[PDB]
């Protein structure tokens, strides 16, 4: 029983790892979208005036 | 009248209580977040460091 | 720096002779002449007297 | 006869002891080793 129920803990902790490595994918790619459209200050500042 | 059609269902969303940092700059309120905890716990390089 | 140069390894261990005007006790007796006390009252303000 | 008595010290009444967890162990001469096995999972 404790080999069985010690095996169901491993596979969930391998699969909670599955979803929560994909929620980092959101925070990566959304920040990666911003940096493609983010020019620096010295380029954009004099275009602001 | 267009704003109710422009809201596109972002009205009627249930509001909640979010914990984050804020700051006061002039007439504008800005939120401050540093993302190294989500990058250095996984031991990848950060894109903010250029 | 003169005040912490005198040691406190005193063999009495309990004789509290004189107290201050508030409840503390006098550490030492700083004895000068008049032409030095007249300047050590202005800089160092007397408190209890 | 005039004697001195030195000031006695306590370990747990010094502010050093914020940097130590303190469990009294009755028979330490009966111990060989001790160990703490950390298990660090890692997200990706």
Swiss-Prot record, chain C:
Q: What exactly does this protein do?
A: Self-assembles to form an icosahedral capsid with a T=16 symmetry, about 200 nm in diameter, and consisting of 150 hexons and 12 pentons (total of 162 capsomers). Hexons form the edges and faces of the capsid and are each composed of six MCP molecules. In contrast, one penton is found at each of the 12 vertices. Eleven of the pentons are MCP pentamers, while the last vertex is occupied by the portal complex.
**Locations listed in the record:** Virion; Host nucleus
At the top level of its lineage, which domain of life is listed?
Answer: Viruses
Protein source organism: Human herpesvirus 8 type P (isolate GK18)
Underlying gene: MCP
> What family classification does the UniProt entry report for this protein?
Belongs to the herpesviridae major capsid protein family.
Q: Which residues form a coiled coil?
A: none
Protein name in the entry = Major capsid protein
Q: What interactions and quaternary structure are annotated?
A: Homomultimer. Makes the hexons and eleven out of twelve pentons. Interacts with triplex proteins 1/TRX1 and 2/TRX2; adjacent capsomers are linked together in groups of three by triplexes, heterotrimeric complexes composed of one molecule of TRX1 and two molecules of TRX2. Interacts with scaffold protein; this interaction allows efficient MCP transport to the host nucleus. Interacts with capsid vertex component 2/CVC2. Interacts with the small capsomere-interacting protein/SCP.
Curated annotation (Swiss-Prot), chain D:
Give compartment(s).
Virion; Host nucleus
Its quaternary structure?
Homomultimer. Makes the hexons and eleven out of twelve pentons. Interacts with triplex proteins 1/TRX1 and 2/TRX2; adjacent capsomers are linked together in groups of three by triplexes, heterotrimeric complexes composed of one molecule of TRX1 and two molecules of TRX2. Interacts with scaffold protein; this interaction allows efficient MCP transport to the host nucleus. Interacts with capsid vertex component 2/CVC2. Interacts with the small capsomere-interacting protein/SCP.
The UniProt similarity line reads: Belongs to the herpesviridae major capsid protein family.
The role this protein plays is:
Self-assembles to form an icosahedral capsid with a T=16 symmetry, about 200 nm in diameter, and consisting of 150 hexons and 12 pentons (total of 162 capsomers). Hexons form the edges and faces of the capsid and are each composed of six MCP molecules. In contrast, one penton is found at each of the 12 vertices. Eleven of the pentons are MCP pentamers, while the last vertex is occupied by the portal complex.
Q: What is this protein called?
A: Major capsid protein
Query: What is the native source organism of this protein?
Result: Human herpesvirus 8 type P (isolate GK18) (HHV-8)
Specify first residue, last residue and whole-protein length for the fragment: 56 to 99 of 1376
């Amino acid at each position: 029983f404790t080999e069985y129920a010690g095996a169901i803990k491993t596979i969930t902790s391998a699969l909670q790892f599955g979803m929560d490595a994909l929620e980092r994918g959101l925070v990566d790619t959304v920040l990666a979208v911003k940096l493609r459209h983010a020019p620096p200050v010295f380029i954009l500042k004099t275009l602001g005036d | 009248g267009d704003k109710a059609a422009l809201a596109d269902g972002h009205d009627e969303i249930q509001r909640t209580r979010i914990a984050a940092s804020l700051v006061k700059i002039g007439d504008k309120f800005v939120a401050i977040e540093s993302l190294q905890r989500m990058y250095n716990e996984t031991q990848f390089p950060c894109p903010l460091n250029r | 720096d003169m005040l912490a140069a005198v040691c406190e390894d005193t063999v009495f261990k309990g004789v509290s002779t004189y107290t201050t005007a508030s409840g503390q006790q006098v550490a030492g007796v700083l004895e000068t002449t008049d032409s030095v006390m007249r300047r050590l009252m202005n800089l160092l303000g007397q408190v209890e007297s | 006869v005039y004697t001195n008595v030195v000031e006695f010290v306590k370990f747990l009444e010094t502010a050093l002891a914020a940097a130590c967890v303190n469990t009294e162990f009755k028979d330490l001469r009966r111990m060989i080793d001790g160990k703490i096995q950390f298990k660090i999972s890692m997200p990706t």
